[PDB]
Amino acid sequence: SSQVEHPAGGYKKLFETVEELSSPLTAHVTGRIPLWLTGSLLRCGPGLFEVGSEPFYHLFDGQALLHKFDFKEGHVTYHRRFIRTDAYVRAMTEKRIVITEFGTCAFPGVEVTDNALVNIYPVGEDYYACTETNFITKVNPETLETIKQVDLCNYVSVNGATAHPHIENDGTVYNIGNCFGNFSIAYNIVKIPPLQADKEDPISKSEIVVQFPCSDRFKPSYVHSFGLTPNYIVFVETPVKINLFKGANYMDCFESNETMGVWLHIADKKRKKYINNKYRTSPFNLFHHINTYEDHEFLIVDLCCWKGFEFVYNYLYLANLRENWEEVKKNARKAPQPEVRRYVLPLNIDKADTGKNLVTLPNTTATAILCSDETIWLEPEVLFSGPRQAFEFPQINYQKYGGKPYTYAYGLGLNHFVPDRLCKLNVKTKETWVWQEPDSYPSEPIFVSHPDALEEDDGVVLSVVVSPGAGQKPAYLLILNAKDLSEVARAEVEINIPVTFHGLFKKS
């Protein structure tokens, strides 16, 4: 066995419109749903890929659909509702595309999209669906009703914020976004506090804690996520640049800087100060940090990388993802290559070590060379590398190991950009585990710990799987044992489920 093939083309169902439900369906359980598993798997993704005869072009254009699998006493329900954003509501009103999406211009001031199709996260006692703009949407996690639109610009100085905020155990939320900060561009870290006794909305207490500089005065890098430890914030500035100068959509504004490579930045979290260490390495795209942690006076930075400066999103138009298998493979031939990489950033830079490798840790092959111009050139330790086989959408045991020394990551395996397997990676030994079934296309795995867990990987991962082959249920919730990715149960439904990006498990 080598290359897994998908000639039947079932992955097309990931990109096909569905209708919302009026109320939850019961799901047919096979195997055994863990009896300790009590709560809601909430996930976001596109659900409407055209408004009548007007199509959406890009993967990130379809209208936000909020999904929920509920678990109780070994039984499972499924429910979904479109998020009532301005983009969706106005589209349903005017029966056309009203708001410009990432890769779809709307034809008839700057009406920025609030299509919150990417992720959902808690703030205080509330939950917010999001994309990557200034608009986030408050949602009801039980009914999936849309509550309110929130403009972050009303509270803090950012043009947007990522769909990947970090959330500390006390409920503090950290996020990053491009801003104006000289009349130069910069990146601001936003901090949203936990809900206090006064019970006021935490978003009204938002503040900028630290600012990162920009490599280009007028062009911020695209930032999808960032790293957080107890003491440090890590930001990776990639050569994918947003041209603020330039019937255009967002996608038309991106360009690749050929000469800058990647700049890595650290800030002291507690002292709220940028550290002027000029970390540099070769060009790559970065969407998802896996995890970050401190080891002696070094930051361990585990990344899902794409080797090259070409923007990976160029390969994610719906027309291309809907092609037949042979064409899908051909399309990916010249794309950046995915690779899981560990970078190690020294915090203590001694001039006496100019010209030498500063990474004195015993358990890594990552290096960091102090140059005479004071730049620190980084080389990674490669943890996982497969030909056009990405370990993507990484997840860990976040609550206990986020920002801390860890061993295990879980991922969605992309086969020429098509999700077709689930993966587990031991980041110390590089051992992997895989779950895969033919004609089955899974989603990001989310880890849920066993309540009496002793080890890091004592629990399950949850994934939403599309399996449209005739003589099969069209979709199901997959439960794997986190130890070995062995199948524990499925909760089958008799309707299609389109692609979802990110989500969370809300314990009850």
Ligand X SMILES: CCC(CC)C(=O)Oc1cccc([C@H](O)CCN)c1
Ligand Y SMILES: CCCCCCCCCCCCCCCC(=O)O
Shortest Å, Cβ 381 to ligand Y? 20
Quote the DSSP letter at residue 198. Answer: T
User: In the numeric block, which tokens belong to residue 457?
Assistant: 């990987």
Question: What is the DSSP secondary-structure string of 430-449?
Answer: --EEEE--TT-B----EEEE
Is position 166 annotated in a ligand binding site?
no
CA quadruple 478, 171, 345, 254: dihedral sign: positive
Is position 224 annotated in a ligand binding site?
yes
Which amino acid type is present at position 115? N
Residues 68-107 vs ligand X: string with x where CB under 6 A?
----------------------------------x-----
Query: Where do we find the tokens 């999904």?
Result: 67
353 is a contact residue toward a copy of itself (CB under 8 A): yes
Among 357, 407, 426, 432, binds a copy of itself (CB under 8 A): 357
Q: How many angstroms separate the CA atoms of 329 and 335, rounded?
A: 10
Among 417, 433, 435, 447, binds ligand Y (CB under 6 A): 417
Q: How many angstroms separate the CA atoms of 125 and 434, rounded?
A: 36
Q: How many angstroms separate the CA atoms of 11 and 323, rounded?
A: 10
Shortest Å, Cβ 412 to ligand Y? 6
Q: Using CB atoms within 10 A of its CB, is residue 182 exposed (0-12), middle (13-18) or buried (19+)?
A: exposed
Shortest Å, Cβ 309 to a copy of itself? 7
Task: Compute how many other C-beta atoms are within 10 angstroms of the C-beta atom of residue 230.
Answer: 11
Q: Which does 222 bind (CB under 5 to 8 A by kind): a copy of itself, ligand Y, ligand X, none?
A: ligand X
Interface segment toward a copy of itself; rule CB under 8 A; list 173-181, 186-194, 359-367, 400-408 = 359-367
118 is a contact residue toward ligand Y (CB under 6 A): yes
Task: Please name the residues in contact with 11: beta carbons below 8 A apart, sequence gap of 6 or more.
Answer: 321, 418, 419, 420, 441, 466
Shortest Å, Cβ 426 to a copy of itself? 14
161 is a contact residue toward ligand Y (CB under 6 A): no
Among 253, 275, 349, 488, binds ligand X (CB under 6 A): 253
Shortest Å, Cβ 414 to ligand Y? 6
The residue (of 160 and 419) whose beta carbon lies closer to ligand X is: 160
Q: Which does 102 bind (CB under 5 to 8 A by kind): ligand X, a copy of itself, ligand Y, none?
A: ligand X
Q: Report the residue closest to ligand X, judged by CB.
A: 160
Breaks in the chain (C to N > 2.5 A) come right after 108, 181, 246
Among 8, 29, 209, 369, binds a copy of itself (CB under 8 A): 369
Shortest Å, Cβ 176 to ligand X? 10
Which amino acid type is present at position 340? V
Among 499, 503, 504, 505, binds ligand Y (CB under 6 A): 499
Interface segment toward a copy of itself; rule CB under 8 A; list 7-15, 112-120, 190-198, 386-394 = 386-394
340 is a contact residue toward ligand Y (CB under 6 A): no
Q: Which does 363 bind (CB under 5 to 8 A by kind): ligand X, a copy of itself, ligand Y, none?
A: a copy of itself
Among 276, 372, 454, 470, binds a copy of itself (CB under 8 A): 372
Q: Which does 417 bind (CB under 5 to 8 A by kind): ligand X, a copy of itself, ligand Y, none?
A: ligand Y
Q: How many angstroms separate the CA atoms of 279 and 377, rounded?
A: 6
Which of 213, 286, 218, 278 minimizes the C-alpha distance to 253? 218
Q: How many angstroms separate the CA atoms of 55 and 17, rounded?
A: 11
Interface segment toward a copy of itself; rule CB under 8 A; list 12-20, 179-187, 295-303, 351-359 = 351-359
Number of residues that bind a copy of itself (CB under 8 A): 43
Shortest Å, Cβ 6 to ligand Y? 13
- 461 contacts 410 by C-beta, under 8 angstroms: yes
Shortest Å, Cβ 163 to ligand X? 6
Shortest Å, Cβ 449 to a copy of itself? 28
325 is a contact residue toward a copy of itself (CB under 8 A): no
Which amino acid type is present at position 144? L
The residue (of 117 and 378) whose beta carbon lies closer to ligand X is: 117
Binders of ligand X among residues 107 to 136 (CB under 6 A) are: 113, 118, 131-133
316 is a contact residue toward ligand Y (CB under 6 A): yes
- Characterise 197 by phi-psi region: left (phi > 0), alpha (psi -120 to 50), beta (else): alpha
Among 50, 86, 207, 379, binds a copy of itself (CB under 8 A): 379
Task: Please name the residues in contact with 87: beta carbons below 8 A apart, sequence gap of 6 or more.
Answer: 63, 64, 98, 99, 101, 113, 114, 115
Is position 502 annotated in a ligand binding site?
yes
Strands (E), 308-450: 337-346, 367-370, 375-379, 381-384, 389-395, 408-415, 418-426, 432-435, 446-449
Which letter, b or e, does each residue of 108-146 get, where b requires 16 or more Cβ atoms within 10 Å of its Cβ?
eeeebbbbbbbbbbbbbebbbbbbbbbbbbbbebeebeb
User: At 327, which helix (H) or strand (E)?
Assistant: helix 325-331
Is position 58 annotated in a ligand binding site?
no
List residues near ligand Y by CB under 6 A.
59, 118, 163, 287, 312, 316, 392, 412, 414, 417, 419, 443, 499, 501-502
What residues are designated binding site for Fe cation?
164, 224, 288, 502
What residues are designated binding site?
164, 224, 288, 502
List residues near a copy of itself by CB under 8 A.
3, 256, 258-259, 281-283, 307-310, 333-339, 353, 355-360, 362-367, 369, 371-373, 377, 379, 381-382, 385-388
